[PDB]
Amino acid sequence: MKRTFQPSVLKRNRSHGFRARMATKNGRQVLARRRAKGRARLTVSK
Amino acid sequence: AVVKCKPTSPGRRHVVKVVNPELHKGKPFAPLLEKNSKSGGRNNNGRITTRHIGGGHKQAYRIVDFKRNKDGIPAVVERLEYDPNRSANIALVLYKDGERRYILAPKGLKAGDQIQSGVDAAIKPGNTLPMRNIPVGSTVHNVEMKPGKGGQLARSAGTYVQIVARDGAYVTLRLRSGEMRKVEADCRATLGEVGNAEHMLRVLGKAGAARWRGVRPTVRGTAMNPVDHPHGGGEGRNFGKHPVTPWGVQTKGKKTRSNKRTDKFIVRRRS
RNA sequence: AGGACCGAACCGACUAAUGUCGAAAAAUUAGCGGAUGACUUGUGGCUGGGGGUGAAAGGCCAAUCAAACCGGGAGAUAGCU
RNA sequence: GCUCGCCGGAAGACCAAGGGUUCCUGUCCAACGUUAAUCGGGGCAGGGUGAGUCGACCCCUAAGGCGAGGCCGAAAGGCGUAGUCGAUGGGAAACAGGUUAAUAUUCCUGUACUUGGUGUUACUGCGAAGGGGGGACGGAGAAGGCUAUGUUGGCCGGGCGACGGUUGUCCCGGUUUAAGCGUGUAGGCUGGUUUUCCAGGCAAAUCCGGAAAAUCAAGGCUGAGGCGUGAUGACGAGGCACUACGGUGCUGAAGCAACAAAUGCCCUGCUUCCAGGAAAAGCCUCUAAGCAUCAGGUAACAUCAAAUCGUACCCCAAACCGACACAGGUGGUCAGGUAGAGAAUACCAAGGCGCUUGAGAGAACUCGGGUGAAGGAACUAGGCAAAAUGGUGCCGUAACUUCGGGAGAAGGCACGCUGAUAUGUAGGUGAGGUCCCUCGCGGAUGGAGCUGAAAUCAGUCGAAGAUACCAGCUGGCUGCAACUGUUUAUUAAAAACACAGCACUGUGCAAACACGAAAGUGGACGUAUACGGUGUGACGCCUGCCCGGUGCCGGGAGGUUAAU
RNA sequence: AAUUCCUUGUCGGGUAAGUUCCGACCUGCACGAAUGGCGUAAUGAUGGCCAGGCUGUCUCCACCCGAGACUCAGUGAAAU
RNA sequence: CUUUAAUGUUUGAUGUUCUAACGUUGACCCGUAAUCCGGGUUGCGGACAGUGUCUGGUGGGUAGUUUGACUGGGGCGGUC
């Protein structure tokens, strides 16, 4: 059984990386909400 | 030539091949080649616009000369090649100045034949002449709608258009569809009929031929659910509805021609 | 030459048995069909919700789909328990 | 430490993705390991990752993303040019041995290679986002030359041996050596040399292409392998001396021939097929602008630099995804010996493991199997499951048929071992000698030597010789569907879906149709022998009547008919 | 008949026994000609029936080989 | 005033011709090492096509809704 999650750091970074988030304002709004909530991990990164 | 394969097995039982012995058995002219990435029916938005398109063997686009701007330059037909993009076969043409191009191959053209474009052209097949110079009552192919466009009529295999009348600056052309169209005389045209007239004889044998030719399976409306198609639904193959397109437009005998712009050039419709 | 034949890798699950608080939130054993093509697979992208895709079953869309998930209207309304 | 068992196309070794110190040592059983534990992938401390040649990095780019100007859109934003990203691809270079408890193609020893800067020497025209060649390509299939690899023989060192014999045609282990350099063959491709001209290559060109000629008929490109050097070097069985008794130092003989042979190289090769099989950069060449006492380039020499990042460990698993130390899933590479057609199957080498609860007894019952008296489907919805055949060679093979098939139809006989044919045949390979040579990796004879099926006779042991694993049950009637194929991941694989064919209809190309407030796209860089929709579904007979109701097309005589 | 209430329609084959199957008739509730009718070689992990071998499916179960079940030592849940 | 007629006037519906609006997903040149876009010339259509407001018709394609109650198995039948 191949489960839903098949890790691939390149895909992770290119789909949920900070650059991708800032590419569109919606991701910028997500980042703003994360900062307002004060999460230590703003996004997924090494 | 048309040949029928022996029924060595199902799939080969109904295969009828269209073999052209004189075609070039070698690589095409690389300088005139161009990449042709498939779209699979997708568009800029990426959604499927036209269905039943996808897959198929890779094919490289050939830059085929249509406008034929080499006026007054005699040229020789080096050889004939099969163009996957077009339904007919293309011909490599070398001009006296030392350049090679591709043209549509008429029925009467073969290797080593002489052709020439421009107004000062004869009536032999392959020559390019405006309808004003072309005598009335002749069959032509690769005709232009406007000067310099390149050519849009009679580009398939074994097709042609007949010159019927001459209304001064305009010429009447009967197309293979029975359409009587009016075209400005300044437009160019090529004499003769396109080659590979036996294109209909091919039957493709099996599913795989169409599958790798670029056509995907077609699903009938009756087999679809009501949520997707206007047809379908009901136990036991029930239709109870007039034929309609998947999008609600009534098909099977409903004219979709609403332009009112080019109708001035339309003399008669199909019948 | 074959959308050919028998048959390994590979793909799938047609039958039986076990397992249903199981080794496993559909699995294991022997049979089973394809195995040069309409085949399969690795990598990278495109098609985003009344929308996508769909050889079409109302099938799949992150173990959830006759309309996914996340937050808000919202302490929706409930003559009901 | 010695026995017994398992994998060995893996249950072995490398990696890619994915983890982040799980890797080694010292130290402890507080918590975890489905039991204990001194043990561990557990707790604490220390050490460990060395690159011009590996990869990333970097030049170019496909699908695709972003997108200066620009178009459109209430705003957000959507499309898109020039440009820039984007490896799943193309571009330059290293191999052998040794070493740590943990690194090695990185460190040490030896031999090399590639790209640029600087300087010296001798020549010379250089010079591009520009032009040309190359880069540069599909499916299927056959042969030949080879190699990795394996078998045998000779040689070397040792042994003759606890239950019979083993100085003999006997047994054990080795017989390995790279990259680079020069020769360049087997093979493949292509006709060359010279002159003149041309509106072509969006301007030019000595470059490409084309047109004329005189000459020879060869030249040129690519190209595995083998051969010498690399290498009187490393490695090498075994022996010798000390052992914190795990281990360290010295020494070190032969290192050859034949056969078979690959899915790996010649091969991006060669022959056919239609489904016609990426792009750009590096690289060679030509010139525009500008300079040609310069600058720049070429050839030889010396020197400098090649930065930065990962290098441990697991990587078919205890370390990745499955909440677990989970009978599941995970891409590529090497993958040997015997029997075997085979990467199947049976036993093994190398290498890795006995899967983290066991000790007793041998109740019913459950799970996986073995055997079975007589009947052989009488059990059951149903031959469900089980049982049975199963391979090679030879003879033979029905009805129908689209003449291909059915068919491996069905159905009949021989398979072990030894001797002879033949002190191993046919066949394959092929030494030395002899003769030529357009003289070397050259051509004939020749068979030394090695390998080596298939078949006949005779004999012989066994109840059975395809003796183990592996390995179709068979035929007839019959509905469905032409067939192959796909579907409800996770109760339905089918008569359902799809299919090649057929018929109607729409579209003249700023085409119809669909995504989009619109741009713009697919259709299509295609075009009536082209594309979309509909219904049926190979092939043969065909597809009868009906226009009243509802759609579609054409008509306008006459009545109604909004905005204005 | 993949269509049929009456129905297991009537007749012959297959078994001694056949609501299934094959062939013949049509009294077609309620087949029918491209939402196709009629045949069709080959094809099918397709539906039904029959015949040959085979056997533990069964008459009717019996023994044996391994893991559970049972006893001991250590760890130690659940539904309710 | 009922009935008519040349001239000059308001003009509308229709027909033919022209271009100066508009279209050009026709050709050439430039911004530009540019299939985008804009500009300049030309050709072809041309007051057509197309767009904006109102308006007649079609419009289960899409969106919001309804489909009463009594009713002894259900609906039917019957009543309000």
Which among B113, B70, B112, B118 has a CA at the least distance from the CA of B95?
B70
Query: Resolution in angstroms, to 1 decimal, for this deposition?
Result: 3.1
Q: Could you tell me the CATH number of the domain that includes residue A30?
A: 1.10.287.3980
The method of structure determination was cryo-EM
Asked whether the beta carbons of B50 and B41 are under 8 A apart, the reply is yes
Specify the amino acid at residue B200.
M
Specify the amino acid at residue B107.
K
Domains annotated for chain B, with CATH where assigned, are 1-113 (2.40.50.140), 117-194 (no CATH), 195-271 (4.10.950.10)
Number of domains in chain A: 1
Burial of B127 (0-12, 13-18, 19+ CB in 10 A): buried
Sequence-distant (≥ 6) Cβ neighbours of residue A46 within 8 angstroms: A9
Q: In angstroms, rounded to a whole number, what is the distance separating the alpha carbons of residues B94 and B77?
A: 7
Positions 118-147 in B, CB within 7 angstroms of strand F: 146-147
SS3 B194: strand
Q: CA A9 → C1' D52, Å?
A: 30
The continuous run of DSSP H or E covering A31 comes out as helix A25-37
Asked whether the beta carbons of B111 and B78 are under 8 A apart, the reply is yes
Q: CA B233 → C1' E8, Å?
A: 37
Please state, in angstroms and as integers, the Cα–Cα distance from residue B40 to each residue in B43, B47, B79, B156, B215, following that order. 9, 10, 32, 22, 9
Q: In angstroms, rounded to a whole number, what is the distance separating the alpha carbons of residues A22 and A17?
A: 9
Residues whose beta carbon sits under 7 Å from strand C? A 1, 3-6, 8, 10-11, 14-15; B 8-12, 15, 42, 45-48, 51, 54-55, 205-208, 211-212, 216-217, 219, 223-229
Q: CA B126 → C1' D465, Å?
A: 80
Give the nearest nucleotide to B147, CA to C1'.
F26
Residues in chain B: 271
Q: Which structural domain range is residue A46 located in? A: 1-46
Q: What is the DSSP letter of B71?
A: B
